[PDB]
Amino acid sequence: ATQEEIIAGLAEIIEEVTGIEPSEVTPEKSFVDDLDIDSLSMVEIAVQTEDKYGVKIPDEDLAGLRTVGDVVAYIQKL
Amino acid sequence: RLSSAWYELPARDETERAAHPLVVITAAGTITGESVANGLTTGQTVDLE
Amino acid sequence: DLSLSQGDWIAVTPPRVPELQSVQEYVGSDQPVLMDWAVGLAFPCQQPMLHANGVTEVPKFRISPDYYAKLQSTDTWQDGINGGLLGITDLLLRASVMSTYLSQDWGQDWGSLRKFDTVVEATPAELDFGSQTHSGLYSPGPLRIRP
Amino acid sequence: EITSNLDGTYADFVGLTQISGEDAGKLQRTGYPDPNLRPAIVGVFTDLTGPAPQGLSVSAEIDTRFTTHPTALKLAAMLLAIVSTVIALLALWRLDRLDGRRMHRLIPTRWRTVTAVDGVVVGGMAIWYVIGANSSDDGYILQMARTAEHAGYMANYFRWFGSPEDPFGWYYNVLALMTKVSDASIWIRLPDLICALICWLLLSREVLPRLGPAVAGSRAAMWAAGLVLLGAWMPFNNGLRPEGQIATGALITYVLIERAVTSGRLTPAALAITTAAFTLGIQPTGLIAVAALLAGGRPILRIVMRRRRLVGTWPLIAPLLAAGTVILAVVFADQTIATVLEATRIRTAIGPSQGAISRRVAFVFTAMCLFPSLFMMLRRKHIAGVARGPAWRLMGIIFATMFFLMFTPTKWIHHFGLFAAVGGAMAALATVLVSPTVLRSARNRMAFLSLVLFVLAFCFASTNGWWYVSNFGAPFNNSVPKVGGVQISAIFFALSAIAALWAFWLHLTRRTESRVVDRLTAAPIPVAAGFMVVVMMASMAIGVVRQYPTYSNGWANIRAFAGGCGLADDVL
Amino acid sequence: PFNNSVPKVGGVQISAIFFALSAIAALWAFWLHLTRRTESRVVDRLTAA
Amino acid sequence: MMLRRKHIAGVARGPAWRLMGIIFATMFFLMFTPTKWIHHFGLFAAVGGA
Amino acid sequence: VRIARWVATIAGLLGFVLSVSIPLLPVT
Secondary structure (H helix, E strand, C coil), X not given: CCCCHHHHHHHHHHHHHCCCCCCCCCCCCCCCXXXXXXXXXXXXXXXXXXXXXXXXXXXHHXXXXXXXXXXXXXXXXX | CCCCCCCCCCCCCHHHXXXXXXXXXXXXXXXXXXXXXCCEECCECCCCC | CCCCCCCCCEECCCCECCCCCCHHHHCCCCCCECCCCCCCCCCXXXXXXXXXXXXXXXXXXXXXXXXXXXXXXXXXXXXXXXXXXXXXXXXXXXXXXXXXXXXXXXXXXXCEEEEEECCCCCCCCCCCCCCCCCECCCCCCCCCCCX | CCCCCCCCCCCCCCCCCCCCCCCCCCCCCCCCCCXXXXXXXXXXXXXXXXXXXXXXXXXXXXXCCCCCCECHHHHHHHHHHHHHHHHHXXXXXXXXXXXXXXXXXXXCCCCCCCCHHHHHHHHHHHHHHHHCCCCCCHHHHHHHHHHHHHHCCCECCCCCCCCECCCCCCHHHHHXXXXXXXXXXXXXXXXXXXXXXXXXXXXXXXXXXXHCHHHHHCHHHHHHHHHHHHHHHHHHCCCCXXXXXXXXXXXXXHHHHHHHHHHCCCHHHHHHHHHHHHHHHHCCCCCHHHHHHHCCHHHHHHHHHHHHCCCCCHHHHXXXXXXXXXXXXXXXXXXXXXXXXXXXXXXXXXCCCCCCCCCCCHHHHCCCCHHHHHHHHHHCCCCCCCCHHHHHHHHHHHHHHHHHHHCCCCCCCCCCCHHHCHHHHHHHHHHHHCCCCCCCCHHHHHHHHHHHXXXXXXXXXXXXXXXXXXXXXXXXXXXXCCCCCCCHHHHHHHHHHHHHHHHHHHHHHCCCCCHHHHHHCCCHHHHHHHHHHHHHHHHHHHHHHHCCCCCCHHHHHHHHHHCCCCCHHHEC | CCCCCCCCCCCCCHHXXXXXXXXXXXXXXXXXHHHCCCCCHHHHHHCCC | CCCCCCCCCCCCHHHHHHHHHHHHXXXXXXXXXXXXXXXXXXXXXXXXXX | CCCCHHHHHHHHXXXXXXXXXXXXXCEC
16 A cells, blocks of 8 residues: 555545556656646545545645645655 | 410610519419429420510 | 319419518508518518507518418418417407519519408507506416317 | 306396296396307497497406516515526635636637637638528518517517417517517527627637647637538528527537536526526527436536535535526516416417428438547547547537437427537537547448438438529529539539548458548538538528529528618519 | 127226336336336335335 | 347347347338338237337 | 534525425515
8 A cells, every 4th residue: 555555445436536557557658748637626625535535635736736746745644 | 295486575774674674574373483392304395585 | 274174273363563561661660560470580570569568569561481481380370269369359359361482583482471451440459457456376377268 | 238258148138028938937037158159349339320229348457467567575576686687696606716716817818819610610710600591480570570669579480369479478579679679580680690790719729629729729620610600500590580599599508508617617507507497498409408407417416515514505505506597587587487378278278288401400410420439439449639528518518419319309309509509519529539630440441431422322312402582593592502414412422422431441351551531531511511501601691692682591681771661662 | 709890808908008007117117227126026026026 | 128138047148139130121122111001019919029 | 513503404494494485474
């Protein structure tokens, strides 16, 4: 769950919202430079991360941390 | 089959021709005519000579 | 009359050069007309026979769609047997269709225009109105409909 | 004295005895107890002239059921229900902002990136707004909108006994208010332009990015959405028959329920409730908005169960049913429930109690895009690029509206207006599904191209005939379209049979890899929609320039700026 | 039985009876869609063939 | 069901798909193209039984 | 909050009761 289970689970939720299979979903690639998300779509994954992890992500810290290393490095900040 | 007597047409003027486009006859019955709902159908042949 | 059949014949009337005018010139925006349901958007300027508190203005003309749509679709939609405006105007007025020609498109059935004519003197009514009635959900009876 | 009441018609002669018959007390009370046999008063006519004899007085009570206006109590109740629901909605918005997420960067980053499809489905929509065809019931709506202001009760003018189709007509009050200014066809149809523009601007920028990264990445998908939108919009709802507004409202409540799911809030859902109520309020064929609310009901109820833990369950469900019932404040503005049930029972008593080259399009733009997309969404359980959630809700809208609108509701069949909005995005779903990167087998793609050409053959079979005055100077208004001797329907059927045998040969040999198919079937939906759009805009362009010095639809709408009538100016 | 009219057993037509039971089954399905049960036996005993 | 479930247990996928293809393929060159009054059920009495 | 919930529920049910009562009101 450190950087394996959580990453895979969050990619299953990315799969739930952005419709990209969990193979391409890795930390090295990101939202607007490699994959395709948007300012509005990222709130869906944010609220689902608030769902399975009790981590009330500020609306500004969500946009501030930019890549998908954001979600890992932040869910491991309980 | 009847050929009618000749009718005195109006004066030779374009300002008369403007606002008198039609010469009309109040005919009846089946008559060959060029409609646009259907083609040039064939009733009877009455026409202005 | 080159036809041996009994269902063929012709009739003829002498030719004329009619004094044509546009509809907007002749029928202005003062005389109310019974525009049929298929043709309202094509004629935007003439006000219809607007009705006020259950009574209508007596219509002067009946601008109507093309003959086939007039016979099969329009008149069935507007007759007295199922509501209709032709319940009141055919019972009162006498329709007499005139001649109309679509300009520079001769041979096109644009529609028709029927001049109504009254059968009496036919003064417009006075209609004394009173307006105090405050029902909750009180509808006094059903309207007269077909049997 | 003669009477004719509800239980009347006893035209009795007071104080007179009958000479033959029975005496029955000798009062001459004769008649039939029946409301069915009443007179139809067109006036009162006589032949006698000169001063009234004392006793002569016909004083009839006319029918005045619907011509009403609300008293002070009912008006104050309406204003209070409106201000109370807006107070409840803004209180819900205040309570709902407990996750933070403030509205920052207005007009989201996926907007303002205008591309060539936007310029096409804006310019061609404006050109169709000017020169294009009207709907069938354009005059039916216009005439009652014109008379409704002076009458003051929105009368269904023609058919029923002056009955107000005020059970559901508020949009006609918008047209009635619009008719205070000049009622030229170029101007009164302005809602059909505005709802087309905001329909497109919602579809391209807020529906399709929500539908997934794949549909947004592919240009062909947005191009197909644009051309199917324009092709479905232009025949049916460029008149006054209010099916562009129902399409727009069903798209609004769908994209708002999408906003509610993706953001995790409840106020876009609460707005989607009253928006679905208003689009249900436009026509009884506005049940597509209810169908969208039902088929996006499960995540909303999940969001309700999600916010149930923190706040009370009751202050969340309360503004929802508030916005659900505020439709009654607008619909019952000057109509009492008694009079609407009376109008309903007249409409069911005597009304109807339950074929052209571009009016049978409905089979082209849902019936061969939604079905292959459905089969692809079923066969592939998880595709790459399509968000499975909103794509399935987009299917459910089109399917669910059929099962209680197409078969059960009585509204003439052959409708495509409504699915102009949401069935536009369905095509954008379909084209990336049948794209060569998702469908791997060339057999299936070639069979789908055969289905495209078969349906286009089915569409061109009929005559190019528009409803009434649009039909002024059209390529093939009288006959079947035949380019080069033989009909073009035969050309599409020959190319469909060629594609069918080309697919069956790949079925037998089992190739799946011949490039020729890849180069051929690369996005066949926007090619078909482009052909339908171009043939319709060509039909009406040839219509306006053929009949130029006389009355066309386009020359009438252009000349309407000059203060001229549409058809009256050139009917001699 | 009903060569001239619509089949009506017991006053109201049997088409209405099937439409009422279809709407009942439709709402019973939609409630299972919302609550997400998938296991109530009553359905198993009802929809067996 | 045959589409959603790729391999069911008890249904032979081959002849079941040919049984579908008979009913579907007859529609696309008999129901719409051939001129024989619509509303037919006779033909599918046999194979549409299975 | 506890200052928006109570106004949300009283205005919710107030709008409900008022809007459903709007067809059965008097008219002149």
